[PDB]
Amino acid sequence: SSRVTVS
Amino acid sequence: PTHADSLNNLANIKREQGNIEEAVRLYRKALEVFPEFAAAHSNLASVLQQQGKLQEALMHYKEAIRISPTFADAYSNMGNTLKEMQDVQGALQCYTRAIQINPAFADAHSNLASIHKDSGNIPEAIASYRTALKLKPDFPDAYCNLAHCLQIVCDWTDYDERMKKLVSIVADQLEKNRLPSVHPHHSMLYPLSHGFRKAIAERHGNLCLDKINVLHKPPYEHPKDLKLSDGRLRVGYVSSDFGNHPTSHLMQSIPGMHNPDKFEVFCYALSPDDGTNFRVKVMAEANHFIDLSQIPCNGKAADRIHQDGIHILVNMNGYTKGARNELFALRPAPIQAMWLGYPGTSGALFMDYIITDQETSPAEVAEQYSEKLAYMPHTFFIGDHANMFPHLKKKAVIDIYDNRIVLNGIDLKAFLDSLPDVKIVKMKNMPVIPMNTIAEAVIEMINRGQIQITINGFSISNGLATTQINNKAATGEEVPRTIIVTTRSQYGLPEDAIVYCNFNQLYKIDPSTLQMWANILKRVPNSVLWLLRFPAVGEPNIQQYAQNMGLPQNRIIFSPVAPKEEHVRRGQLADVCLDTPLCNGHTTGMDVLWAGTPMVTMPGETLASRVAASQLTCLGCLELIAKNRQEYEDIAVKLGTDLEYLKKVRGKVWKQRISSPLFNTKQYTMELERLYLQMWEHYAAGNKPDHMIK
Numbered sequence A: 001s002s003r004v005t006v007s
Numbered sequence B: 001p002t003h004a005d006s007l008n009n010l011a012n013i014k015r016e017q018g019n020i021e022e023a024v025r026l027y028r029k030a031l032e033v034f035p036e037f038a039a040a041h042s043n044l045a046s047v048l049q050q051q052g053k054l055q056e057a058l059m060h061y062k063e064a065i066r067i068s069p070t071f072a073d074a075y076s077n078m079g080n081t082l083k084e085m086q087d088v089q090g091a092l093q094c095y096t097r098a099i100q101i102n103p104a105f106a107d108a109h110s111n112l113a114s115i116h117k118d119s120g121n122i123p124e125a126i127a128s129y130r131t132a133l134k135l136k137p138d139f140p141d142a143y144c145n146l147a148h149c150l151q152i153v154c155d156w157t158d159y160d161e162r163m164k165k166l167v168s169i170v171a172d173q174l175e176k177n178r179l180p181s182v183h184p185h186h187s188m189l190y191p192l193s194h195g196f197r198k199a200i201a202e203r204h205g206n207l208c209l210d211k212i213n214v215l216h217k218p219p220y221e222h223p224k225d226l227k228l229s230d231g232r233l234r235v236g237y238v239s240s241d242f243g244n245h246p247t248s249h250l251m252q253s254i255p256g257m258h259n260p261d262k263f264e265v266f267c268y269a270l271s272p273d274d275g276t277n278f279r280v281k282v283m284a285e286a287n288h289f290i291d292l293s294q295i296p297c298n299g300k301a302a303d304r305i306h307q308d309g310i311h312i313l314v315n316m317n318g319y320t321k322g323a324r325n326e327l328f329a330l331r332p333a334p335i336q337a338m339w340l341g342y343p344g345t346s347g348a349l350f351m352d353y354i355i356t357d358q359e360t361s362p363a364e365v366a367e368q369y370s371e372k373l374a375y376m377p378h379t380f381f382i383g384d385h386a387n388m389f390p391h392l393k394k395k396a397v398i399d400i401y402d403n404r405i406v407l408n409g410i411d412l413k414a415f416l417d418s419l420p421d422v423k424i425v426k427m428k429n430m431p432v433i434p435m436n437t438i439a440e441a442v443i444e445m446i447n448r449g450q451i452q453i454t455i456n457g458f459s460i461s462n463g464l465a466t467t468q469i470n471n472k473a474a475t476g477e478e479v480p481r482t483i484i485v486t487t488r489s490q491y492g493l494p495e496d497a498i499v500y501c502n503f504n505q506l507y508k509i510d511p512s513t514l515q516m517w518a519n520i521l522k523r524v525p526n527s528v529l530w531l532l533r534f535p536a537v538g539e540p541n542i543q544q545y546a547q548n549m550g551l552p553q554n555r556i557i558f559s560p561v562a563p564k565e566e567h568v569r570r571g572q573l574a575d576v577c578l579d580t581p582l583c584n585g586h587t588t589g590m591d592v593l594w595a596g597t598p599m600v601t602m603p604g605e606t607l608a609s610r611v612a613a614s615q616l617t618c619l620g621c622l623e624l625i626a627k628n629r630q631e632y633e634d635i636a637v638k639l640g641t642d643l644e645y646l647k648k649v650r651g652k653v654w655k656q657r658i659s660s661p662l663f664n665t666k667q668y669t670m671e672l673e674r675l676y677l678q679m680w681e682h683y684a685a686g687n688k689p690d691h692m693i694k
């Protein structure tokens, strides 16, 4: 869907 | 078996301490003395899992269970192992089996909650963390993780008490030198001191040091000159985000813009090829592209970095998903710097520098960071928008407003010249298409939900249908080859009122911030705040706390998360962007600025709270940077009521996004180059890392 900054 | 039990308990203490090798040795010796020892199998499995020996781990977890079919621990730890191997179905079977065996097993509930969160089922994650806490009220991991779920959906029930308790939990954990339960990446969201934030990070850095000490690597020997590299600085960009990820959307042009006379660029990918043009472009344009995802051992992977000869090794992950900071802990390069992907200090002594800027990280707060500051001269932020979305460099409208009905396209000028009666308008140059048979047909396409039409042989597309027309243009992988229409009506926004936007994930919003936004909306009747379903289940919390503040429902309009190009294209329909002070829009900040949309921000102290102010300073719009909340509200209200002042600020943004350094990837690369060479001089002259505040 949509990629983000994650831990 | 008591011989065995004392070996096992020793092993457990050796493990808590971070002595992993020795812990393993003892678990094995425990089993050597007592082969049918379930807990030793499980604990050994569990430390092998820490070491990345996932298969060997599973084998011992199953021994444990075979020996003791009701051993709930082994099932719960096996679930985490399966989860690490991306076998969600297997992990869920293990966790639920553990809870079925013992419904009062709190860790199992907490781990089941964690996989629910990761799957984007927040209500169920919250419920299972609550069960965990109900069973074990003193449970830091589960509390802090619950606190993050609540943050994510903007649940602020007992907010101040919760914040106070996160701080207290972290205080306690840091006193006991245990791994804090607040993740370093989340730590900017809570009222922790900079010392607490730095220490949180330091502790996760230490994890990496502990894991590499099993390998017993001597220090690597590092170049003191550029002789073996023919006079070129060898720079290694390490990232798990060379693919369809914000990082590549920021920096994908940097590698190939480097100056090959004086630099040699190596990209170390930590992820496998996702098939996207982002990956294709960095693989093509870097001088050397190395796929470390094919090299699981961090010893052997650091070895490679050392034998490529890297001078400056660049950490683009910090504490994010995909990181392999173990690589940096081994120090395969003489200079190691944090850049771009991680908005915080690493807290680790293996990172020498953080690349940043005066606005983002002022000297006053240099003790916020373990690293020395390496200042870029404008902002450290960068965006690849000029390359990805050059169809947004110019725009045209239909009938005079700059943001109700908008057309963009590479061939827009040619289409305009095909029309009888186009007017040009000087910005305080914008083509305007009068109300016309052509204007009517475009609007008709939108209203009816049509995908595209043709006018004078030009393809005219509905901005809502990008994935049906060209899915690679939607993602930003390709530049759109049609003309796109974008309008306020496509998003339920009113043609006649001021639209404030913020397109970040909802977690960056906090009570104080929503209170500002409400104040502003109250002061500007018939304006709206335009937010995203990110996630959708944060929407009713937001709406409700806004009703409590005095606002009616229609004042906040939610849209869905869109493909990347639509997201960017659509910010054009807004008047103003109200940035989140708690944690700014970073990538999101560049997105909205590229639409020509001014952003009001209030820089805080943390790096994450200052980035938009740095973007804006580089952009040359100091007027949009607030020193307190009254300023922030006045600026925003002024931009919503003083409409000529709104024209002027918008014209300034619109043109400064081209004429200023902000989106200038070449200039940025060259400035980055000067700074790398400063860093290199200083070390080649035998000195140690020190501040480079130019």
Ligand SMILES: CC(=O)N[C@@H]1[C@@H](O)[C@H](O)[C@@H](CO)S[C@@H]1OP(=O)(O)OP(=O)(O)OC[C@H]1O[C@@H](n2ccc(=O)[nH]c2=O)[C@H](O)[C@@H]1O
Pocket: A002, A003, A004, A005, A006, B245, B246, B247, B249, B250, B340, B341, B342, B343, B503, B504, B505, B532, B560, B561, B562, B563, B564, B565, B567, B583, B584, B585, B586, B587, B588, B589, B591, B608
């Ligand atoms: C706080 C934080 O972690 N900050 C990080 C930075 O410090 C790093 O420098 C950035 C580069 O790694 S990423 C990150 O920057 P952020 O501003 O937080 O954006 P985030 O991580 O939420 O991603 C949202 C994405 O959705 C895209 N997006 C958004 C809305 C939409 O509808 N569609 C869409 O594609 C957006 O274009 C984005 O691509």
